[PDB]
Structure 1
Amino acid sequence: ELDRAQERLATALQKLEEAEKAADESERGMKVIESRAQKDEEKMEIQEIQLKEAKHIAEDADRKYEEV
């Protein structure tokens, strides 16, 4: 029974390190993507603010054209 207990200890201790290792890498991968996600989100908002103006200017030009 001792041999079995030692055997399970080996595979458990090893899998424990792998599980912890994966937890760090997964968190590492989450961080690098989270940062990029925030940068994109911010960039998207800014562009859409310009998208508003771009249209209002285009419409204003059309209304200004109708007058002339």
Structure 2
Amino acid sequence: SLNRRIQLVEEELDRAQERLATALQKLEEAEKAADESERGMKVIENRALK
């Protein structure tokens, strides 16, 4: 019985690492997109004010 308990816990842990790995790259991608919109701000604003 203890062998199967170990197997189940190990599989759940591996799934947890995979989910964290996906979350980190999604975070980086969202941060970069926000930075890109932030640069777009001033050029659009300059054209509008002129």
TM-score, length-normalised on structure 1?
A: 0.64
CA-CA distance at 1:38 after TM superposition: 0.7
Query: What percent identity do the matched residue pairs reach?
Result: 14
Aligned length: 50
Gaps (5+ residues) in structure 2?
Answer: none
Say which one has the larger Rg: 1
Segments ≥4 residues shifted beyond 2 Å: none
Q: Does 1:58 align with 2:44?
A: yes
Q: Provide the alpha-carbon RMSD of the alignment.
A: 1.2
Gaps (5+ residues) in structure 1?
Answer: 1-13
